[PDB]
Amino acid sequence: IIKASTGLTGLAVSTNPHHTLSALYGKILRAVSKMPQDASYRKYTEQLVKQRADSVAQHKDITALEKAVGCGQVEELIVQAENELILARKMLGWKPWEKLVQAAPAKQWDWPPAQIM
Amino acid sequence: DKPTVRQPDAVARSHLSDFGRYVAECLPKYVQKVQLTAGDELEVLIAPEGVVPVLQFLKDHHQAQFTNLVDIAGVDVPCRKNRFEVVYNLLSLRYNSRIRVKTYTDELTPLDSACEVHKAANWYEREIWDMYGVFFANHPDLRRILTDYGFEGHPQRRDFPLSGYVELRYDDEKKRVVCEPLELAQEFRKFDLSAPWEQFPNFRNANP
Amino acid sequence: MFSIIFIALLILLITTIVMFLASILSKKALIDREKSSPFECGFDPLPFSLRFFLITIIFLIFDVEIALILPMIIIMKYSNIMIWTITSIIFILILLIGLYHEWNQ
Amino acid sequence: AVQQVRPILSVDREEARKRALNLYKAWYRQIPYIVMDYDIPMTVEQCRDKLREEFVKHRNVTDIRVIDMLVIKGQMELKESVEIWKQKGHIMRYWKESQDPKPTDFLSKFIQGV
Amino acid sequence: SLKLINERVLLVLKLYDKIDPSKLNVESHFINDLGLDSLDHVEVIMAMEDEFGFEIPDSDAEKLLKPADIIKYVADKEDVY
Amino acid sequence: QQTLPVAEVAQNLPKKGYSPFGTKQSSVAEWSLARLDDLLNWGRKGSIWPLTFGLACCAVEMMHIAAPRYDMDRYGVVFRASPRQADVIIVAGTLTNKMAPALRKVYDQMPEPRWVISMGSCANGGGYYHYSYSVVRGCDRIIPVDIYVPGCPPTAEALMYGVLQLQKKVKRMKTLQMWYRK
Amino acid sequence: EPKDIVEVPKGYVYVNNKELSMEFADITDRAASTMFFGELLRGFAVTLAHIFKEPATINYPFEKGPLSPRFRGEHALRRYPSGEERCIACKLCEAICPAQAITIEAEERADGSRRTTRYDIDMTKCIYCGFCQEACPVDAIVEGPNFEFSTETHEELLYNKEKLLCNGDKWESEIASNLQADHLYR
Numbered sequence A: 001i002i003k004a005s006t007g008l009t010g011l012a013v014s015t016n017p018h019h020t021l022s023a024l025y026g027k028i029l030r031a032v033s034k035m036p037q038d039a040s041y042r043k044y045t046e047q048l049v050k051q052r053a054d055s056v057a058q059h060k061d062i063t064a065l066e067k068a069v070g071c072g073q074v075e076e077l078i079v080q081a082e083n084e085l086i087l088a089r090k091m092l093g094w095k096p097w098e099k100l101v102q103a104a105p106a107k108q109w110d111w112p113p114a115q116i117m
Numbered sequence B: 001d002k003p004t005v006r007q008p009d010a011v012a013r014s015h016l017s018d019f020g021r022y023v024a025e026c027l028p029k030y031v032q033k034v035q036l037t038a039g040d041e042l043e044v045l046i047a048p049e050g051v052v053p054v055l056q057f058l059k060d061h062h063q064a065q066f067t068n069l070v071d072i073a074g075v076d077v078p079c080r081k082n083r084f085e086v087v088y089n090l091l092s093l094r095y096n097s098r099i100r101v102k103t104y105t106d107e108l109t110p111l112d113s114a115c116e117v118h119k120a121a122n123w124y125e126r127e128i129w130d131m132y133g134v135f136f137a138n139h140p141d142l143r144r145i146l147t148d149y150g151f152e153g154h155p156q157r158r159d160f161p162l163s164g165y166v167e168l169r170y171d172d173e174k175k176r177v178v179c180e181p182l183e184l185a186q187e188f189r190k191f192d193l194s195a196p197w198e199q200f201p202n203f204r205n206a207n208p
Numbered sequence C: 001m002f003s004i005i006f007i008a009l010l011i012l013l014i015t016t017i018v019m020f021l022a023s024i025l026s027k028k029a030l031i032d033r034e035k036s037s038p039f040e041c042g043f044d045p046l047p048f049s050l051r052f053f054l055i056t057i058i059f060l061i062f063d064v065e066i067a068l069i070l071p072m073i074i075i076m077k078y079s080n081i082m083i084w085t086i087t088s089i090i091f092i093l094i095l096l097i098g099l100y101h102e103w104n105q
Numbered sequence D: 001a002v003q004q005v006r007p008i009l010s011v012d013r014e015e016a017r018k019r020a021l022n023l024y025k026a027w028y029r030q031i032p033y034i035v036m037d038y039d040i041p042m043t044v045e046q047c048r049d050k051l052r053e054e055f056v057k058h059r060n061v062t063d064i065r066v067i068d069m070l071v072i073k074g075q076m077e078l079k080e081s082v083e084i085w086k087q088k089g090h091i092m093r094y095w096k097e098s099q100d101p102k103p104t105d106f107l108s109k110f111i112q113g114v
Numbered sequence E: 001s002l003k004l005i006n007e008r009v010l011l012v013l014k015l016y017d018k019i020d021p022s023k024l025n026v027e028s029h030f031i032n033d034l035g036l037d038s039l040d041h042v043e044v045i046m047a048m049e050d051e052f053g054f055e056i057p058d059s060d061a062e063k064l065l066k067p068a069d070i071i072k073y074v075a076d077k078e079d080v081y
Numbered sequence F: 001q002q003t004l005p006v007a008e009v010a011q012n013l014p015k016k017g018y019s020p021f022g023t024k025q026s027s028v029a030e031w032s033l034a035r036l037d038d039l040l041n042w043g044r045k046g047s048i049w050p051l052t053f054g055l056a057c058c059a060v061e062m063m064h065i066a067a068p069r070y071d072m073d074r075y076g077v078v079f080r081a082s083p084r085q086a087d088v089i090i091v092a093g094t095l096t097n098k099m100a101p102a103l104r105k106v107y108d109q110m111p112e113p114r115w116v117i118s119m120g121s122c123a124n125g126g127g128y129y130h131y132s133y134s135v136v137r138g139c140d141r142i143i144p145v146d147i148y149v150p151g152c153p154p155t156a157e158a159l160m161y162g163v164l165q166l167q168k169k170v171k172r173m174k175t176l177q178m179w180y181r182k
Numbered sequence G: 001e002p003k004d005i006v007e008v009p010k011g012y013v014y015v016n017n018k019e020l021s022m023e024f025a026d027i028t029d030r031a032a033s034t035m036f037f038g039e040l041l042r043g044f045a046v047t048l049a050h051i052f053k054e055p056a057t058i059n060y061p062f063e064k065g066p067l068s069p070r071f072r073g074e075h076a077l078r079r080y081p082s083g084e085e086r087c088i089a090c091k092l093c094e095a096i097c098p099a100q101a102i103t104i105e106a107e108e109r110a111d112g113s114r115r116t117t118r119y120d121i122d123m124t125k126c127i128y129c130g131f132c133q134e135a136c137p138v139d140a141i142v143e144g145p146n147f148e149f150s151t152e153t154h155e156e157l158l159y160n161k162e163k164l165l166c167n168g169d170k171w172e173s174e175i176a177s178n179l180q181a182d183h184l185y186r
């Protein structure tokens, strides 16, 4: 039983949301597998993608999956998975797990500016 | 009980503190300092090289969908070495929260345009450029959005005068609206509203 | 028709006399550079459009078609009934089929 | 006395001078369209003389980021001049019209109080 | 022909106001020997684009010193050989 | 000022009449030109067509004389969008530096007679942005203004009072008498 | 009753959520409303019923619309019942005036009073915000009931001390009645 409309303009109802979600989570895992293990983003992304893949594997119904995940509808889950895949393929280029490229200068981040010493 | 004192929201404090430590852990390259201000607002103080990779991250992560960008604000603090600061305020509709991402920028040093991340930065980054001279590189078209077409200078810097440099009047010899040096009929009366006694002892040593 | 020429020339003469007296009665001020300018809203300042031209062409084709629908009110009492009905039904039916075919394609 | 910064629109002074020459070339090509499309009293030769005067006013600068800032603002004014967004009064703001020329000698400034 | 575009280039150089009618030659440059500023050399290049009717790229334009180099690149553009 | 006349004094005063000139002209040609100017000013004050020139908040009150409570249409006053068809321009809002050649061009394309109403403190004197970098210090430096309506958002009775003061100015216009004395 | 395309939650209301009806009675009803202009007939009837309504035109200036005792109009300078001017030149009104219209210059008078030598309010600069009457410790400066003070000339709206004192002399009854009927709210 598929829904008539998702309630949002411009979003189409997915015919196969389970396979799309599983393929997107597998692509996110294959993207973050190239990252070093000491990076925190890889560990947190692997944890959330593993628990959401367990959620889409335990529940074969659409409405039970949207109730179990709890973050919007399943089309929004597909949108979030594509967004995270884009983010991870940008993380493999940007490499943000290293040190700071520019430290804060002196008297930069203190707000009251003209106080002496 | 104190009914004239605003009570802070603890569920907007603990979640924002855990998320601030989370975003400090996930991006150690760009994030220098996260701080939870009075009023339960979270500030992230990034490097100027990390404007795009931080605002992309908060756009597209599962634990942070800061997909709405409400306003990009420029503050001119001429005391500092990098005088301008640029504040991106982001709203997360999925997790019902707000974040502020602050960076420091000089007028000659360019900044990364967030137009590829959020399309509202197509116009907001123009406005700071019209008012501070903060050049945003890799912008679609960086034009003059609010001031006059023949305006020379950026008005919202603190080194710019309040009444401007020039005025406009109609010349019926040239049959056009001409530009004249400024002469006010009554000058702006600068009031010295400075407090000689300090009133906040908690902000006395907040600078280091 | 000769009275129609006289009354149309009188209407034209009266309107030109009224406009000439209005131009005399209009207040004559000093003419200006900006007052003679064409009006664009506010700040001072079109190519050929084919869609409007085919609109005019469709109007022309249907106008010449209407000019053959015009006579047959008089002819209905002075012609063969079967021939008149066959031509009228065929005329408006081919017009309707052409209109519906140009709508669908 | 030397710092490492992020370049804006240039990486060397010869490249910045080349892009300033691009700006001058495009302004020189856009002069007779500015004279034609605006109702201004200034002619083509006066517009070219004003363009040369505004370039030799900024002849003195040396810094790469400053000259790239000048090139960027000049290209923005040019883009406001190709597409007609400036008016006839905005074009004639380069020539200081409706302004009395202030004297340079000390005696006339002493009589006038300046 | 080379002589036709040679006469065309020298005609356009004697059309310039600041250049004196003497010292017109193929070999001598405009920067140091002649009194032309770099804002005047680009005016000579725009005079080339006005008379010939085609635009010169800047990367080709910055290499130019003498009228010999002017004939040397316009002979490739005009296809005389 | 003058004290408004007490009814004991004012009962001895005669009626003013419609004409500000009076019917006591000496020459018959001067009297005929006076009555022709009275008819011309009655036709001009009987219908002034203001222009839809709404710059800022003051214009939200300008529509409030269009509104059914105040009803500008029974005063000869009806909005026209084109500047050629309009008599009056009501500067209702904040004239800025980018707004100056647009207002001057719109006023210059308007045909003469041209009465200008400055609506609000931004229109006359600059007002609350008088010390701003990009606000013209009143519209009196650009467009010549006949009526100045005082309130920051003028109440709509005060804007219509400015309209009636403009109608009294139009009724006081002397053109043919000046032509006879030119 | 058409079905819902999107299930309406408890705290929300949905517009244009009804399904288009497909039974023949509703199709014929919509067809007759399209062909015979039934909804346009209802719009015409609703329009024509407003001709018979009472007009709300209040016939200015014989009849003037409602005001309030708190109303902000022409600024004016009041006086004591003994006759001395109330304004002690204490300059909180100029300090609180956001458009900085008020200019005060003060000297000691012959009997030793503090009262002003110059009190100018630029009414072309004044925004009629009423901060001066709230910031007035005595009840000197006040927002009068007058708003029919449109001027022919730009300079006539530059109010002097004598013009404000004449406004206080002219409008004293209504200003005193408004201040008597409004002081316990402030």
Ligand code: SF4
Pocket (backbone or CB within 6 Å): F056, F057, F058, F092, F093, F094, F119, F120, F121, F122, F123, F127, F128, F151, F152, F153, F154, G127
């Ligand atoms: S005068 Fe007052 S109400 Fe009118 S535009 Fe200015 S601020 Fe707005």
Ligand code: SF4
Pocket (backbone or CB within 6 Å): G086, G087, G088, G089, G090, G091, G092, G093, G094, G104, G132, G135, G136, G137, G138, G140, G141
């Ligand atoms: S606040 Fe009142 S008493 Fe004080 S200076 Fe102003 S008007 Fe006078």
Ligand code: SF4
Pocket (backbone or CB within 6 Å): G075, G093, G096, G097, G098, G099, G100, G101, G102, G121, G125, G126, G127, G128, G129, G130, G131, G132, G133
């Ligand atoms: S009402 Fe406001 S703007 Fe007017 S004089 Fe008082 S404080 Fe100033």
